[PDB]
Amino acid sequence: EVQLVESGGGLVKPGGSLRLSCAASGFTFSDYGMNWVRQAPGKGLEWIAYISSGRGNIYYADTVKGRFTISRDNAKNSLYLQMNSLRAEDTAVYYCARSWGYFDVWGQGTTVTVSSASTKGPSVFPLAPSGTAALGCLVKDYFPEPVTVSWNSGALTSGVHTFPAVLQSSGLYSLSSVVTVPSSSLGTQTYICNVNHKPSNTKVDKKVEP
Amino acid sequence: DIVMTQSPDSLAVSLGERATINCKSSQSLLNRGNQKNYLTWFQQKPGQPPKLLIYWASTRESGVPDRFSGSGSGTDFTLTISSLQAEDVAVYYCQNDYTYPLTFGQGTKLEIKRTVAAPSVFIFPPSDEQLKSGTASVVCLLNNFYPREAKVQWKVDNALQSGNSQESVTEQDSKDSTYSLSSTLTLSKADYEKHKVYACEVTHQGLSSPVTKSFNRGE
């Protein structure tokens, strides 16, 4: 089976550097042109770098030329992106993509955040319920993105709404996750939101009681 | 650059009906040496890489249902999605594959058009745990409404609030094609404890007049 897997993304300060990697399997890597394509939060796709198979022709988007360099190691079925002189506008999910006149294989992406702000884990607060009731968890003041939220370790999915994170004026993110339930379920069920903030290695389970 | 321009920027189409997304290039995409128009269409859902739908302007990728169809030539291209299904809600992109730099259209958001549905509204006071730390977040939840347009206003002791709230909206629900929305009012703890009535006022096409949910601090 054909697979592409990016790694190396993380938080880095403006002016800093970072190397991304992409490992490939399930096809003859050396026979294909390979690419990096990125997507800033809430924006469209932007192709940024290419390296061909035989001649290794190299093309860059002007936005990264002179700062980013693409390379490949066919013995390791690997593609690299060396990113120097990073700017806030380089914040994005970075995808590895195979091409044959069009991008036909994509990785899941690796996320790069360029900011001077420090990593901070969230505080988790209950949204307590008052024939429909609502309850939830407020996940406040974290950096950088992302946080993930599940309910009852993934067993509760129906009626859940986990909202997109919002950037506060403080430069920290916040989001809420809610669920609607029949009001009679409040006495027969336990509600626990499981919050994970990997950039800070924070894991919290908060029980939500009326 | 070859500049790629999609039309419309967003589109709402009823289940089972036909969706049409247009893409115009600022220059020809026709390869004179193999006669292919190097125009490519992608579908992208949140949290996922884009999925290849059509390449060479009209060739369907393997596994793509035949209800997806690409057409056009020169500088004018069209993606058609017949018999729209809920799984087709996504952002669609066209892309120049002809010459570098490879350029994308700005994307077109396709949603399901369904009947009007008024929200259920809920209000949450801040937790005692949060209050202790110096901050008060008041949350107003709008549940399972359509269309997305809604006005949510905060009133504190009956005075309209400005500048101290932020909203977030979910993607269309897979089962009923509705949206949900949260509005969060943020005050300091000292400020929060100076007021009594906290109200969220919701205006929406599904509601005959605005709906208010409120609580009295300490009650």
Residue numbers in the entry:
A (entry chain H): 1 to 130, 137 to 216
B (entry chain L): 1 to 219
Sentences copied from the publication:
CD40 is a 48 kDa type I transmembrane protein that is expressed on a wide range of hematopoietic (B cells, monocytes/macrophages, dendritic cells) and non-hematopoietic (activated epithelium, endothelium) cells. Engagement of CD40 by CD40L expressed on T cells results in the production of proinflammatory cytokines, induces T helper cell function, and promotes macrophage activation. Disruption of this signaling pathway has the potential to reduce production of proinflammatory cytokines, reduce T helper cell function, and inhibit macrophage activation, making it a very attractive therapeutic target for patients with chronic inflammatory disease. Therefore, we determined the crystal structures of ABBV-323 (antagonist) Fab alone and ABBV-323 and FAB516 (agonist) Fabs complexed to the 3 extracellular domains of human CD40 along with in vitro functional assays to better understand the protein interactions that govern agonist and antagonist activity of CD40 mAbs.
A crystal structure of ABBV-323 Fab was solved to 1.74 Å resolution and the ABBV-323 Fab/CD40 complex structure was solved to 2.84 Å resolution. The structure of ABBV-323 Fab alone illustrates two loops (HCDR2 and LCDR1) which create a cleft of approximately 25 Å with a diversity of charge. When comparing the complex structure with the Fab alone structure, there is a backbone shift in HCDR2 that allows opening of the cleft to accommodate CD40 binding. Mutation data supports this structural observation: a HCDR2 S56G residue change results in 20-fold improvement in binding affinity due to higher flexibility introduced by a glycine at this position. This flexibility most likely aids Fab cleft opening and facilitates a hydrogen bond interaction of (H)R55 with CD40.
